[PDB]
Amino acid sequence: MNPIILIIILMTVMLGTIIVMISTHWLLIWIGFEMNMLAIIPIMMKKHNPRATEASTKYFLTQSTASMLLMMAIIINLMFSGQWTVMKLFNPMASMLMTMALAMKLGMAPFHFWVPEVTQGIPLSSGLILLTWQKLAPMSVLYQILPSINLDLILTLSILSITIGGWGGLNQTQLRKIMAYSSIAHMGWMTAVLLYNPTMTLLNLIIYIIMTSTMFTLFMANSTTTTLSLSHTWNKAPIMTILVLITLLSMGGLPPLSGFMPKWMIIQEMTKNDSIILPTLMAITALLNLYFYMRLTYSTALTMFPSTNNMKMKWQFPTTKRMTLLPTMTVLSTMLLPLTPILSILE
Amino acid sequence: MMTGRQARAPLQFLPDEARSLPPPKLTDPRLAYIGFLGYCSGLIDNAIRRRPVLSAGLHRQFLYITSFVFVGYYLLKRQDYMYAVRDHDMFSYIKSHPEDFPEKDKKTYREVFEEFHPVR
Amino acid sequence: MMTYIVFILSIIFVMGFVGFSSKPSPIYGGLGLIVSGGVGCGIVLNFGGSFLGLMVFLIYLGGMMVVFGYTTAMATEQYPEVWVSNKVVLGTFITGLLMEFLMVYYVLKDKEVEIVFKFNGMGDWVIYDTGDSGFFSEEAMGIAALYSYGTWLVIVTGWSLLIGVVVIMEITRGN
Amino acid sequence: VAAFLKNVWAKEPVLVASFAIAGLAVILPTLSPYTKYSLMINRATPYNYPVPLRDDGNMPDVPSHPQDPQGPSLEWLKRL
Amino acid sequence: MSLVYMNIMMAFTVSLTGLLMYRSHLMSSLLCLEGMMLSLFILATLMILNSHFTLASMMPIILLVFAACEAALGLSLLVMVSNTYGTDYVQNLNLLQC
Amino acid sequence: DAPEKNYERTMAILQIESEKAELRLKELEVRRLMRAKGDGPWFQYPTIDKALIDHSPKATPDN
Amino acid sequence: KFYIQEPPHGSPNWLKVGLTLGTSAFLWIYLIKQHNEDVLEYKRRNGLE
Amino acid sequence: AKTLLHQYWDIPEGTECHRKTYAATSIGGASGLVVSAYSVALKTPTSFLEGVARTGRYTFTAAAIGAIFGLTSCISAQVREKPDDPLNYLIGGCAGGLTLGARTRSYGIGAAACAYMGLTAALVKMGQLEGWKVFAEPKV
Amino acid sequence: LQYGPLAYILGEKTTKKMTENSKLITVDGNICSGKSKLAKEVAEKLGLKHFPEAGIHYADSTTGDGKPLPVRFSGNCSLEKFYDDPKSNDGNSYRLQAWLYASRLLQYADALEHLLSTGQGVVLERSIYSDFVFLEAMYRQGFIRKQCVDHYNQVKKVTVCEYLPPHVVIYVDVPVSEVQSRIQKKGNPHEMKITSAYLQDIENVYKGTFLPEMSEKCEVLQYSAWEAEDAEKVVEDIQYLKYDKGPWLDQDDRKLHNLRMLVQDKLEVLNYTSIPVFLPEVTIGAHQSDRVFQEFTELPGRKYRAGYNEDVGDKWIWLK
Numbered sequence A: 001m002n003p004i005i006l007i008i009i010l011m012t013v014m015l016g017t018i019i020v021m022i023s024t025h026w027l028l029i030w031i032g033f034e035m036n037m038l039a040i041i042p043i044m045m046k047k048h049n050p051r052a053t054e055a056s057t058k059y060f061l062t063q064s065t066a067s068m069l070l071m072m073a074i075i076i077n078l079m080f081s082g083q084w085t086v087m088k089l090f091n092p093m094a095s096m097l098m099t100m101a102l103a104m105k106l107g108m109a110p111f112h113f114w115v116p117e118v119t120q121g122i123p124l125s126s127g128l129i130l131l132t133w134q135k136l137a138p139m140s141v142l143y144q145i146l147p148s149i150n151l152d153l154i155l156t157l158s159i160l161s162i163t164i165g166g167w168g169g170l171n172q173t174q175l176r177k178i179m180a181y182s183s184i185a186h187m188g189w190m191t192a193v194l195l196y197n198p199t200m201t202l203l204n205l206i207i208y209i210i211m212t213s214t215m216f217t218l219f220m221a222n223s224t225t226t227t228l229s230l231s232h233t234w235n236k237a238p239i240m241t242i243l244v245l246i247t248l249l250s251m252g253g254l255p256p257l258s259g260f261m262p263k264w265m266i267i268q269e270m271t272k273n274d275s276i277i278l279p280t281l282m283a284i285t286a287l288l289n290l291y292f293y294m295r296l297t298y299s300t301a302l303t304m305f306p307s308t309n310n311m312k313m314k315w316q317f318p319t320t321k322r323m324t325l326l327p328t329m330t331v332l333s334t335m336l337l338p339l340t341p342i343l344s345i346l347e
Numbered sequence B: 001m002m003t004g005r006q007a008r009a010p011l012q013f014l015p016d017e018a019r020s021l022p023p024p025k026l027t028d029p030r031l032a033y034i035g036f037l038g039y040c041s042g043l044i045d046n047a048i049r050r051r052p053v054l055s056a057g058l059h060r061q062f063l064y065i066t067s068f069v070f071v072g073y074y075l076l077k078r079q080d081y082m083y084a085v086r087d088h089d090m091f092s093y094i095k096s097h098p099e100d101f102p103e104k105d106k107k108t109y110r111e112v113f114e115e116f117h118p119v120r
Numbered sequence C: 001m002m003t004y005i006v007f008i009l010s011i012i013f014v015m016g017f018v019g020f021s022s023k024p025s026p027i028y029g030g031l032g033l034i035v036s037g038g039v040g041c042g043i044v045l046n047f048g049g050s051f052l053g054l055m056v057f058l059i060y061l062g063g064m065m066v067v068f069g070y071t072t073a074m075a076t077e078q079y080p081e082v083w084v085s086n087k088v089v090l091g092t093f094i095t096g097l098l099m100e101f102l103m104v105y106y107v108l109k110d111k112e113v114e115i116v117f118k119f120n121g122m123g124d125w126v127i128y129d130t131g132d133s134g135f136f137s138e139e140a141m142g143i144a145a146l147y148s149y150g151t152w153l154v155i156v157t158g159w160s161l162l163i164g165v166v167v168i169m170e171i172t173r174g175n
Numbered sequence D: 001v002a003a004f005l006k007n008v009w010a011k012e013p014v015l016v017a018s019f020a021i022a023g024l025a026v027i028l029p030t031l032s033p034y035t036k037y038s039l040m041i042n043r044a045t046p047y048n049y050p051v052p053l054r055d056d057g058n059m060p061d062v063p064s065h066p067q068d069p070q071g072p073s074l075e076w077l078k079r080l
Numbered sequence E: 001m002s003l004v005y006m007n008i009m010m011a012f013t014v015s016l017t018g019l020l021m022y023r024s025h026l027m028s029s030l031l032c033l034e035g036m037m038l039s040l041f042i043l044a045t046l047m048i049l050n051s052h053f054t055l056a057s058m059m060p061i062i063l064l065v066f067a068a069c070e071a072a073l074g075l076s077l078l079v080m081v082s083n084t085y086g087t088d089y090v091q092n093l094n095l096l097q098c
Numbered sequence F: 001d002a003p004e005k006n007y008e009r010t011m012a013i014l015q016i017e018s019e020k021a022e023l024r025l026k027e028l029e030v031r032r033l034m035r036a037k038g039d040g041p042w043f044q045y046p047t048i049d050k051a052l053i054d055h056s057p058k059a060t061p062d063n
Numbered sequence G: 001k002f003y004i005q006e007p008p009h010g011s012p013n014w015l016k017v018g019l020t021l022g023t024s025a026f027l028w029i030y031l032i033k034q035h036n037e038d039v040l041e042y043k044r045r046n047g048l049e
Numbered sequence H: 001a002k003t004l005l006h007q008y009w010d011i012p013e014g015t016e017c018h019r020k021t022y023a024a025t026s027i028g029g030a031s032g033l034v035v036s037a038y039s040v041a042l043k044t045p046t047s048f049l050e051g052v053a054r055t056g057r058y059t060f061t062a063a064a065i066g067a068i069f070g071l072t073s074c075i076s077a078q079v080r081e082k083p084d085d086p087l088n089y090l091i092g093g094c095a096g097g098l099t100l101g102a103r104t105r106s107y108g109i110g111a112a113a114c115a116y117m118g119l120t121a122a123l124v125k126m127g128q129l130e131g132w133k134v135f136a137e138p139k140v
Numbered sequence I: 001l002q003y004g005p006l007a008y009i010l011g012e013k014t015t016k017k018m019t020e021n022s023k024l025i026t027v028d029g030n031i032c033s034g035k036s037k038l039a040k041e042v043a044e045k046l047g048l049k050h051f052p053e054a055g056i057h058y059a060d061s062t063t064g065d066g067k068p069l070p071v072r073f074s075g076n077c078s079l080e081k082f083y084d085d086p087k088s089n090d091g092n093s094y095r096l097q098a099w100l101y102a103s104r105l106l107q108y109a110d111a112l113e114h115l116l117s118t119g120q121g122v123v124l125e126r127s128i129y130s131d132f133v134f135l136e137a138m139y140r141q142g143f144i145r146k147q148c149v150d151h152y153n154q155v156k157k158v159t160v161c162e163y164l165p166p167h168v169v170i171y172v173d174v175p176v177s178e179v180q181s182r183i184q185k186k187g188n189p190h191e192m193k194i195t196s197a198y199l200q201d202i203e204n205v206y207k208g209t210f211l212p213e214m215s216e217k218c219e220v221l222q223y224s225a226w227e228a229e230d231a232e233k234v235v236e237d238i239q240y241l242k243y244d245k246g247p248w249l250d251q252d253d254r255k256l257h258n259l260r261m262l263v264q265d266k267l268e269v270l271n272y273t274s275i276p277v278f279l280p281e282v283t284i285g286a287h288q289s290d291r292v293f294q295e296f297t298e299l300p301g302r303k304y305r306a307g308y309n310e311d312v313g314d315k316w317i318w319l320k
């Protein structure tokens, strides 16, 4: 792609997310989502192979269906309220349709059927854009409509996302599908604490974006897209195995790491509201995520899978890659738990 | 929770009343831990580019430490501000609603009957 | 039954939607969507939106001419399904029509109905304004306000159309 | 700049006329004295009813009759 | 509410189930998204012209704009499916199943 | 350390932690009452500004 | 001379070293000035002088 | 089917066994219809007859589980004279697990479903006793 | 770094220096075709940069001090042991062929980097488009297995698709008897163990598979042995070519920018040479890989990045 056009298209993706974040009018929310989808489609088709075209077709169909349901929720709100302010919704039908639309845009289960497909089809950089930056505009709209979100719907979507994203990653050897089912489980964690304390929703979103950006930057820095090619990293750059070790143990929710920070706080806000069964099932179901994270740490860091002969040539060449903010994101994704009361800045 | 507080004054990282609070010391152990995070970022930065980890790029390690201390100072200011706001609103709500918070009469243990459960 | 004219045009609107939503072939899908978008500019033209109906007619005529060209170029099969060639097309076509005229029958006999919302059964002439707007049609004034009041809406819409052209030329390259 | 202008007028004269007309339409309303009178005509076109005022006692600029000398006048539009 | 909103919401649901149940042909369902845009246009416009909220009268035009501004997008994504494969059948797009 | 030092230091620790525990219980009760009643500075979800309302004399009088 | 090719990091990028040290010194002096202004404003708003 | 679980739980335990069995049968039938709908959705049956065969098989499986659960629970609450007791639903959940094993035609699935569905039904009865909330309303 | 998207934005278009002297020319031929001077002779007529043929130690010649590393660090293979024992148990044949394919991929990346950065054309000897003929000769002679050919075809399928062919391919017809005569006059005792059928298979995969598929995407210039002795005739035939075939004609600034961003990153060039296809010829086990990697780190000038080594005399490390 022409880099001026790449700059303009990425600024337009960012502009769509900002127009969703800053606007007080429902039509401008919908315009921001349309602009976001429309601009991110050529980021997915950066390589022009059939898998990117398939991923872009599936992504276009899911996000277009979600935006249709979003605009129908907006028009039913216009009927039952005569106004356009981005606030609570004045009808449970519009509340359900907008919650369905935002759950489709997040790829939360049972609308999850596009996130491993689309994430596998596209490159690692566009997969990073998909799993981090596209989880900011629907979480804005969910942060703004929580007086009208049905409790049973968002909790069913949340625990169904956590369970399905837990079981999905166990059967995977492709790193992008692992990160996609990890995305599904983590969006379930974020939306389960949405009606109890949305500050914990924002905390989980930020810590998740840090850890996911760390993992995709490590994958891009190692040029690995499968488990079995990530397993050659000890013979090429052994510090990267340590970084994926600490980041995957962080993403599993293990103390003393920062990925234990959101989970615990979510439990800390769900037991206040006399819900004991639900965060317990969520915590126990997160052990599946931890299990396929531990599978990746076994294949990469804790053992040494056999490499090839041609790796001896790659010993003679360093990385000329822009590993942008990789030590900063690696430190923030692992050693941030003693700074856990920083979450009050998200109030 | 406190979203209606910061809605009359939007997008203020530190408001004016945040200047009525003591700022964090520069020897704050939270700030020293954030500076240690900057030093660890400098070490990982020299490690992944296969530089000598302790010797190469002392200017770069020093700007890592300086940048984390600089960001973390304002992050600790906003943290302390939001907890002071939490306590101020708590105390004002308890004061403005006395009927919801009755003054308890703490009985001594000579009137309080507790059932003894013998371990035998 | 002439007071029910917007209701009758809305029945033809739903019939066109069952026509192209059964998906026979995008030739006949374009036919059904032209019929629905041409009675939908008669539904909304009886509310005062003469500008705002002729445009959804005209934009969708250009749209279905483009869609015709693509379904003659890309989405073409040797024996296109007219409306009745496939059993799954005709079955859901008859299903949509029978359910639509079923909820016609339940709303003219009872004058009220409830599918998720509650709906009246009287003709929708009842809800119109009993006043006049003077020397301006108010929907024309509101769409004219897109330049005076809608400046940010102009900026984001024109930017979205510009990057729509850029996005489409970046997709349809292949290399 | 003149040789390139002659070159593009020789090769693509439709585009030269296009950029000339577009440049005039950009710069020329900012250089006309009559653009003020466009706004003054548009805000003196009475679509709505001029809803009258309750006379409190101290309004010297507001008339009591349309044929009174005080108030906004349209002699500038009659002369032009 | 009024009688016409029954059938315009009915047409939205008919086009919804037509979109959301594919018949192995991608152009036939890209018509259904355009029909959902038509139904949203007519529904919002009936609501806006009804209540004389005149300043939102520019809203359906804008809505209609983004209609084709994604429909064209779908067609630009229809031709890449129909250049990789001879047809635009949606069951050819199953490579990302593994 | 002296037993006096450990003893009075333990009393200081118990004062600080009992005050924190009573303030946490007060914080939970304040959150419950503010979510239930909506009359405190927290849980003030946005409504429409009345500065947006135009109070000018409109075209028709009955409004 | 050891390396057969001139490496990208043979000499220190003195523009980048100067930018790094200038940015770090500016952030330290701005941090200390901000902290002195904050403690002076605290002592002014509370009279703790 | 929020009212299906309500008309299951609005009946005192050990009083009317036929209506409890019918209510749990209808709960199982609705669960089997949901599983059948997603099963014919995501995995295409080879014919319409095979689709309705899978639908009827899963529906009758889950409805038989519900019927034997409600029957065993209410008969145990009658013969043990302890209506507010989770051991009744432990026996009922093991009867439903043996029902699921007999429908899957295997003993190991029957024993595993006995154990886990008995523990699950016991936890549901304890939640009905102490008022446990899984979808708890936000209070603080 | 030195080149990136920002350099492309700020005016450095890579067709502003693409002149008519910018010709990538690959000279091919059999084992002793006498092309080894011919390419250099072309590079001293057209003003081009000659690259020698990539041996085992080409990557050693591009990095570090340029001296050849010991063979356990580069290659883990020997051409002379391939000449001695071609059907060896340790799989030296395909391991040598895979290392040579990676070395030629690196050399072709260096050639395109020089061509797209300086505008000076490069004269190569046996590029990656002609590397498969030795694989096919080794497979026809039964030196390797079919799984080795499948591994080579996977690596070639995912690596050569991102590059361009040369502009000119020069081929030298030398018969098998003349090749054997030049081998006997060469004096290398390992090279005299080359069988006649291996040379005949090299010539057959040349004339039957390589040149009929390269004649469409570039311009072949097939010479005999005596007329390749005169470089002036060959360079005169090069200078009067009508460059019309191949995908070099439809290359704008954007495509060559994307190619140059691929080409200058050597770990992305060599990304797919080490694919996790566990083949017994090329798979080195865990303990041997750990031992040779830790012995490679202890080499002079190899412990850190190329400007960060006190044992070779790098100064000002604390400001780098």
Ligand SMILES: CCCCCCCCCCCCCCCCCC(=O)OC[C@H](COP(=O)(O)OCCN)OC(=O)CCCCCCCCCCCCCCCCC
Pocket (backbone or CB within 6 Å): D008, D012, D015, D016, D017, D018, D019, D020, D022, D023, D026
């Ligand atoms: C600032 C005022 C507002 C300007 C913006 C609004 C414009 C409104 C009119 C609509 C124009 C839309 C289409 C414009 C396309 C321009 C680009 C273009 O077509 O370039 C190619 C063209 C030569 O055509 P060619 O390359 O041969 O194309 C293949 C077919 N033959 O290349 C050319 O013909 C050369 C184009 C550049 C030189 C044009 C010089 C015109 C000067 C007119 C007088 C000065 C006017 C004031 C503005 C400053 C102009 C520099």
Ligand SMILES: Nc1ncnc2c1ncn2[C@@H]1O[C@H](COP(=O)(O)O)[C@@H](O)[C@H]1O
Pocket (backbone or CB within 6 Å): I030, I031, I032, I033, I034, I035, I036, I053, I079, I096, I097, I100, I131, I134, I135, I191
């Ligand atoms: N892929 C390969 N496999 C085996 N030997 C090769 C390969 N490529 C080049 N050679 C050898 O490299 C030498 C090249 O001959 P020369 O013309 O002297 O450079 C001959 O000994 C060839 O057999």
